[PDB]
Nucleic acid binder design. Structure first.
Lengths: 154, 57, 129, 41, 97, 129, 97, 165, 157, 99, 50, 265, 51
RNA sequence: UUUUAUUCAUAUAAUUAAUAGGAUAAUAUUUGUAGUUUUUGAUACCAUGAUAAGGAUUAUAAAUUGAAAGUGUUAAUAUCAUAAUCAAAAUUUAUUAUUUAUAUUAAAUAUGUAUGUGUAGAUAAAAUAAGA
């Protein structure tokens, strides 16, 4: 797309921990919903993470209930189970978002950023006009007309 | 080293100055120029709720 | 002891070398300016994407070929010519995509991304060969 | 304190000390001085 | 209408920002399309006030206007905490940081 | 001498962390009240220089809130009908209700009418209701 | 000055600085006051004369008041005569319509 | 786009009128305004940061010239700039004296009027008193640094310093 | 002359006294230098009366006179050294080292504030202060407001 | 320590690098080449002899044609521009020192 | 010409290419000959002066 | 003895000192012996004055007028390039003393100054005075400064001079210059007989009699001396036909209360 | 009501209101509070507000 | 048998004592006021103040939009009141929080060298209109 420079990768836990700033930003979530809808597939994981984020952000101000009253034997384990279950749902949504972004890029002839893999037509990470002459993680030298991934016309 | 301040009121008055002070300021001149313990303690304490006072320990 | 004389002689030699370095740098700058560069447009986006026998390429090869040859495919005059011709419109800066500076300042035929690092380093010309 | 003497005109300490006029006062004229009319030159 | 422009244009047609302005008319159990409301900006004018804090300020202003207009709407809005101002303020400038 | 002025002595009073009185400071907040000074109008206080407290421009002689508002004023307002913003915008509406462009000559900013109503009157889209 | 820039040597140049800083003189004249019959028997400024005057004074006229602020000379006594001279020039050129 | 600005004479006009360029020339003559000939027409950049009410820093006046290549060297800046005469610079140049009690009055004149003799500085007095104490204690190790050595190398006739011990 | 009689604890305090002379000479020679520079650098015709070779010769004569002006003060003000008049401490304008209004160094200003020698009102160390112009844009906004008050309010006939 | 932009208290900290061929004129020189030479190139009054020419003086043909010795102040006691050439014309002396 | 607006208009004719000896194999400038020696000038100062 | 100066000379005349020595003089109690700048010898005064302007004036070795053929720095002495060799590649544009002095009409625009010198030349005989009263001659303005009428802050008694200069009233320079240059003659006649302005007076008379009052006033703007009564007479006469009462009163007052009541005719 | 305007009119109104502040004719022929022959404005300056 | 970051750049050169007023004022050449030479702490020493680091705890429930940042000491440093032989213009001299790939020098002389898969050890910071 318009962003073609080198990029670093971050664990999904970091983006999930980022709340209603990037991961749960309503505009970005609406864009993801539009991407799913224009492809005509259900947005079940997106809606699950949306309701999870809404519930979390609504009560983030409130103080936690007294932990002494809660039973460490069972209540703490139940809370950890629920937190892990929510985190797994958000992981699934994150993976789905990345997969569908790659797929839409491939369909629309959109050249991704450097070292970005688009299954079906790159399969090893497209790199073009990078600061390093060689392909990162592959050590393959790169030509100046970097790579024509798609057909010329249109 | 340390200047003598003499905070004592008996170390800063002398008869020579008192002679001239008495004529201008004396008892007559001052008079001329000027115009239930539990309950008393309780009212003293609660009068601190006035608009110009504060509750004091 | 003698450092004044040593530094004076060192600076004399440095200036004598600097004269030749300036001459070589001016020669290299003129040669880079007069030498044809590579096509300074990204061939991966809508305008400069179609086949060579259709779209913008036929217009380039039948309308502005002589001007492009005279400007030697330098990115600034190429963009200015594309703006002046107006047959493409305001798309040059809004929809058209172009190669970066040091990638579009490469010679005519490179075929290798490791070309900007192989240029002459003794010539002080701010990245102009 | 110091070889350089303090300025009694713009120093808030001397201006608002016990021997001068504080800023929480009516700030009226201290005395109606008349020099030129009592004895001109 | 906010500063002579429609609320949708002022908030850039963002549902999560316009719902805050809508909230008082729901908490008071009223109808939004029964009142004309205008918002006048008197703080720092900015080209875009499309943000959560600005929406909160708009919601507070609308709640106060509703309370002034219909006195009985005071109880629902107060119980929902729409007239409760938060004294939170961003850190001031300091060369140390 | 000049220094003879700065020699008046003050006599000591006659009796019968740091800086804080434990008895008054440790008094419960819910009883003492979250106040460090009398609750009189703030116009009577001036931030003391060189001291971290606020004194009154009138030595003692505190005036209550009712000494600044009209008699039997609501919430100590100058007028019981509206708050500050009500008194401002009602005034704006009243002056726009009789604004005449011819009267604006001569004076400066006072000739400009209530902008919110003037511009909405000058807007053609608002004419059609 | 009456605080610390009197009765001493620096008082003179402080007062001179004050006068030079306040040398500005503002002359205000109303167009309605100009729109009167002159000695010859015609209106001193007509509609066209007023329009020409407003064009000549792009920002010096405002709210129907012609204001000329003269800071040309260090003293108000010369600023006033410079302002009167320039106003006379402007009126002479504006009456040409 | 690129064009040539046209002018039509009132005599050539079907109905005569005062042209805006003629009015501009008259206004320039009246107010002694320099007409810049090399002002490009495609640089009508409004100082939006000070003219747009939608901005915090709105002031109603253009606070910038919107020319990147603008400096104090160019004659336009020289002509339209302000001289520092009678400014805060002039105030500081006479008020920020290291010794405050010298802008109001001369020290010698003030001493000769209020007192009978010119007093020295506090530092000079302290040095003199310290010299007095040192002379009382030791009276040795001192130099004889003076401005003019003529009076010390050739003492006046009839001058006999008495010994100490 | 050389540390025999100085009457001052800091001998560098005379630098302020001699810098006042620099300011006085700037006030003397600012108009002449500015006019000479403008006339020399201007390339477009001066007027309808003088054009061409007359203007070129006038420019060269003006710049020759300007170069012959020996002792004319032509120095950028930021190159002038700023030292407080009380303690001879040097400070850089534009940083916290220097206080513009008092025209004293940071050390001198701090000493005078901790003592009872200056009438200032303490505010929060990490805020904008009481001033509305400072709170509504900061140093640049107050700068623009000062400019508007000083100049951009007159008709300037 | 930070100081206002283009107002560094150090005046000689500016390290004039090797001259750049592409500009070679809009760098360390006058912004316009129609401006007159600075005052250091000329003689104001009747002097008794200049110790060394300052580094702000521009280089001219007369420096190499006249043959008179020219020198500037650098890290050593002095530096004389021995073996005059014609390649450095229109440039100031600060660009030919490399401190 | 500076590379700001017009750089492709530079031509080798502007380059002297005679006051230096260049490498006949690579093309770089090997050495530079003396320039002040027997320099040819019609007028060291502008003609209109004096 | 660590004397700064080996020699010194008195300033009072030998006819008056020998008689005034019998009258005791009240010296300063904390410093009876005073050795001011005047008591210095000619060579010592020249050296001190040259050293005074080390920053901007010829005090710096490389600035000029250093009169030294070699400079010792960094343990390496360097000879001096003479002016004859310097002028080969430095074209001389010297004008002389006539360049430093600006016309009298530029005093107001130069903040009460005429000479464009390194030192501020005060017009009062108390700041640049050295024994004799300070007199500033504009036809002998040179860097060497045989008369020490300039103001510098590196001499023996510079502090008091700087204090006096900074503690000056408005129109100090202009008032001193005008009062010292123009005054009533001892014979009681008006100072209206100068030759350097007489052609200007005749020109103004001719313009006034031709009726060019504006030109006459423009020329009168540039006068430096007191004009004769004929100038005022002609100006008023040429203002008579135009009924310019304000102009006539102004030109009368400009000479009545300001210039020795010349217009009182 | 409600107030809706256009951006150009709003900008012009704001700029005009800011500009037209000193263009006030103080001495008029109007009866009442305004309208007089001479107007004196005394500006008092002090270190303290209550002063 | 919880979260964030860290490659940081100028640094020495030489001389410092006094007061003196101008037009519209009933008169001052005071226009243009003339008595060398017996003293010496900092061109390099004042030790004493501030600062850095930096903590404390009562507000039940209803109402109200409310009723809510505070410092010793230990340390280092320094320009101040305190103990005479010498740093501030001639600056190389190494002094923490920097712009990473569509377009890159026009007004006071304003930076040509570190691309390498962003890969160590240590160090600092915050629960403050944000969303552990």
């Amino acid at each position: 797309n318009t962003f073609l420079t080198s990029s670093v990768a971050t664990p999904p836990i970091s983006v999930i921990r980022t709340g209603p700033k990037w991961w749960a930003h309503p505009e970005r979530m609406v864009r993801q919903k539009l991407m799913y809808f224009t492809l005509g597939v259900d947005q079940l994981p997106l809606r699950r993470t949306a309701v999870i984020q809404r519930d979390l952000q609504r009560f983030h101000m409130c103080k936690p209930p007294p932990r002494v009253g809660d039973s460490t034997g069972y209540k703490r384990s139940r809370a950890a189970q629920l937190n892990t279950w929510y985190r797994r749902i958000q992981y699934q949504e994150y993976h789905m978002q990345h997969l569908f972004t790659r797929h839409v890029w491939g369909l629309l002839r959109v050249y991704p950023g450097n070292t970005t893999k688009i299954q079906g037509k790159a399969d090893d990470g497209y790199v073009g006009y990078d600061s390093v002459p060689f392909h990162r993680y592959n050590r393959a030298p790169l030509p100046f007309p970097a790579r024509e991934l798609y057909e010329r016309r249109k | 080293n340390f200047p003598a301040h003499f905070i004592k009121s008996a170390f800063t008055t002398d008869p020579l100055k008192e002679k001239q002070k008495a004529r201008f300021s004396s008892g007559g001149e001052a008079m001329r120029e000027v115009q239930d313990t539990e309950f008393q303690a309780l009212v003293e304490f609660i009068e601190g709720a006035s608009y110009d006072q504060l509750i004091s320990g | 002891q003698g450092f004044h004389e040593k530094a004076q002689k060192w600076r004399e030699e440095y200036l004598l070398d600097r004269h030749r370095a300036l001459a070589d740098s001016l020669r290299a700058y003129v040669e880079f300016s007069t030498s044809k560069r590579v096509e300074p447009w990204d061939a991966r986006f809508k305008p400069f994407d179609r086949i060579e026998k259709d779209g913008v390429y036929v217009l380039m090869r039948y309308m502005m070929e002589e001007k492009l040859q005279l400007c030697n495919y330098h990115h600034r005059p190429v963009k200015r010519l594309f703006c002046n011709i107006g047959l493409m419109g305001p798309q040059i800066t809004t929809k058209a995509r172009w190669k970066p500076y040091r990638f579009a300042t490469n010679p005519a035929g490179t075929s290798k991304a490791e070309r900007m690092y192989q240029r002459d380093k003794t010539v002080y010309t701010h990245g102009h060969n | 304190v110091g070889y350089t003497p303090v300025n009694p005109d713009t120093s808030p300490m001397v201006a608002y000390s016990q021997y001068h006029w504080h800023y929480n006062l009516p700030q009226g004229m201290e005395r109606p001085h008349s020099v030129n009319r009592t004895f001109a030159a | 209408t906010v500063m002579g422009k429609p609320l949708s244009l002022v908030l850039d047609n963002k549902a999560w920002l316009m719902e805050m302005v809508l909230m008082p008319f729901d908490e008071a159990n009223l109808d939004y399309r029964d009142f004309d409301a205008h918002i006048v900006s008197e703080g720092h004018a900015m080209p875009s006030i499309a943000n959560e804090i600005a929406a909160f300020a708009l919601r507070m202003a609308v709640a106060n206007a509703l309370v002034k207009l219909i006195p009985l709407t005071r109880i629902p809005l107060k119980k929902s905490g729409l007239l409760s101002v938060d004294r939170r303020r961003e850190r001031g400038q300091f060369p140390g940081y | 001498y000049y220094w003879s002025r700065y020699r008046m002595p003050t006599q000591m009073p006659k009796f019968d962390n740091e800086f804080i009185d434990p008895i008054d400071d440790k008094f419960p907040m819910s009883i003492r009240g979250p106040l460090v000074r009398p609750d009189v109008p703030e116009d009577q206080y001036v931030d003391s220089w060189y001291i971290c407290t606020s004194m009154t421009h009138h030595m003692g002689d505190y005036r209550p809130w009712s000494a600044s508002a009209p008699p039997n004023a609501f919430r100590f307002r100058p007028f019981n009908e509206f708050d500050a913003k009500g008194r401002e915008y009602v005034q704006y509406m009243r002056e726009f209700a009789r604004f005449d462009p011819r009267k604006s000559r001569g004076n400066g900013q006072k000739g400009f009418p209530f902008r919110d109503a003037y511009l909405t009157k000058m807007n053609e889209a608002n004419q059609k209701t | 000055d009456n605080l610390q820039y009197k009765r001493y040597d620096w008082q003179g140049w402080y007062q001179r600085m004050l006068d030079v800083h306040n040398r500005n003189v503002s002359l205000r004249c109303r167009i309605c006051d100009l729109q009167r019959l002159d000695g010859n028997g015609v209106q001193f400024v007509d509609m066209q004369t007023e329009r020409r005057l407003r064009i000549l004074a792009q920002h010096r006229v405002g709210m129907g008041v012609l204001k000329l602020d003269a800071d040309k000379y260090e003293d108000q006594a010369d600023n006033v005569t410079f302002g009167t001279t320039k106003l006379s020039e402007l009126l002479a050129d504006a009456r040409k319509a | 786009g690129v064009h040539r600005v046209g002018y039509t004479h009132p005599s050539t006009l079907p109905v005569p009128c005062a042209q805006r360029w003629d009015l501009r020339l008259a206004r320039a003559r009246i107010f002694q305004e320099y007409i810049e000939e090399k002002a490009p027409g495609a640089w009508q950049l409004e100082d939006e940061r000070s003219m747009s009410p939608e901005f915090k820093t709105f002031t109603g006046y253009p606070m910038r010239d919107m020319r990147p290549g603008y400096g104090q060297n160019l004659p336009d800046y020289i002509m339209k700039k302000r001289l520092p005469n009678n400014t805060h610079y002039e105030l500081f140049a006479r008020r920020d004296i290291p010794n405050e009690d010298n802008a109001m009055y001369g020290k010698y004149l003030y001493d000769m009027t209020v007192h009978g003799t010119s007093l020295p500085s506090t530092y000079r007095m302290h040095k003199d008193i310290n010299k007095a104490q040192r002379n009382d204690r030791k009276l040795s190790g001192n130099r004889f640094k003076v401005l003019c050595s003529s009076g010390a190398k050739n003492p006046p006739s009839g001058w006999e310093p008495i010994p100490d011990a | 002359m050389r540390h025999i009689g100085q009457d001052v604890p800091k001998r560098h305090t005379h630098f302020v006294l001699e810098s006042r002379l620099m300011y006085e000479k700037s006030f003397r020679d600012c108009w002449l230098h500015s006019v000479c520079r403008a006339i020399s650098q201007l390339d477009e015709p001066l007027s309808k009366t003088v054009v061409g070779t007359h203007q070129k010769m006038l420019q060269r004569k003006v710049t020759c006179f300007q170069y012959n002006q020996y002792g004319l003060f032509k120095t950028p003000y930021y190159r002038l050294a700023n030292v407080d008049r009380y303690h001879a401490v040097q400070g850089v304008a534009g940083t916290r080292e220097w206080v513009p209004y008092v025209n004293v160094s940071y050390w001198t200003m701090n000493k005078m504030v901790r003592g009872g020698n200056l009438l200032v009102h303490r505010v929060h160390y990490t805020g904008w202060g009481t001033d509305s112009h400072l709170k509504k844009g900061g140093w640049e906004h107050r700068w623009n407001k000062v400019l508007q008050r000083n100049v951009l309010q007159y008709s300037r006939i | 320590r930070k100081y206002p932009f283009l107002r560094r208290p150090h005046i000689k900290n500016t390290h004039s690098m090797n001259p750049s061929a592409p500009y070679f004129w809009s760098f360390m020189t006058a912004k316009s080449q129609m401006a007159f030479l600075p005052e250091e190139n000329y003689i104001t009054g009747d002097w008794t002899g200049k110790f060394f020419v300052s580094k702000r003086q521009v280089y001219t043909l007369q420096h190499a044609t006249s043959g008179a010795k020219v020198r500037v102040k650098s890290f050593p006691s002095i530096f004389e521009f021995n073996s005059p050439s014609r390649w450095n014309i229109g440039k100031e002396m600060n660009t030919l020192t490399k401190p | 010409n500076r590379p700001e607006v017009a750089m492709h208009r530079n031509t080798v004719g502007l380059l002297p290419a005679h006051m230096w000896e260049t490498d006949k194999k690579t093309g770089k400038v090997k050495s530079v000959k003396d320039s002040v020696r027997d320099y040819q000038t019609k007028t060291p100062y502008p003609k209109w002066v004096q | 003895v660590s004397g700064v100066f080996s020699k010194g000379r008195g300033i009072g005349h030998e006819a008056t000192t020998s008689i005034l020595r019998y009258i005791p003089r009240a010296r300063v109690p904390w410093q009876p012996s005073r050795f001011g700048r005047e008591n210095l010898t000619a060579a010592d005064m020249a050296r001190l004055w040259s050293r005074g302007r080390y920053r901007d004036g010829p005090g710096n070795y490389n600035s000029g007028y250093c009169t030294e053929r070699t400079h010792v720095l960094e343990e390496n002495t360097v000879s001096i390039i003479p002016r004859r060799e310097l002028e080969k590649y430095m074209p001389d544009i010297t004008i002389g003393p006539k360049a430093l002095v600006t016309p009298v009409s530029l005093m107001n625009a130069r903040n009460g100054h005429r000479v464009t010198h390194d030192l501020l030349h005060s017009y009062d005989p108390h700041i640049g005075r050295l024994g004799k009263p300070a007199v500033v001659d504009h036809d002998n303005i040179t860097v060497e400064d045989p008369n020490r009428v300039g103001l510098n802050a590196a001499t023996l008694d510079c502090r008091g001079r700087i204090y006096r200069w900074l503690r000056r009233g408005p129109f100090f320079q202009v008032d001193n210059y005008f009062r010292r240059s123009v005054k009533l003659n001892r014979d009681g006649t008006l100072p209206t007989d100068f030759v350097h302005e007489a052609p200007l007076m005749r020109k103004i008379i001719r313009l006034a009699h031709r009726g060019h009052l504006k030109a006459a006033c423009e020329e009168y703007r540039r006068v430096t001396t007191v004009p004769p009564v004929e100038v005022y007479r002609a100006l008023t006469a040429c203002c008579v036909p135009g009924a310019k009462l304000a102009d006539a009163v102004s030109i009368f007052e400009d000479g009545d209360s300001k210039l020795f009541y010349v217009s009182r005719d | 009501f409600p107030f809706q305007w256009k951006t150009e009119d709003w900008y012009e109104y704001e700029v005009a209101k800011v500009r037209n502040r000193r263009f006030v004719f103080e001495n008029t022929e109007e009866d009442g509070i305004r309208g007089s022959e001479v107007t004196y404005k005394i500006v008092l300056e002090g270190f303290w507000d209550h002063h």
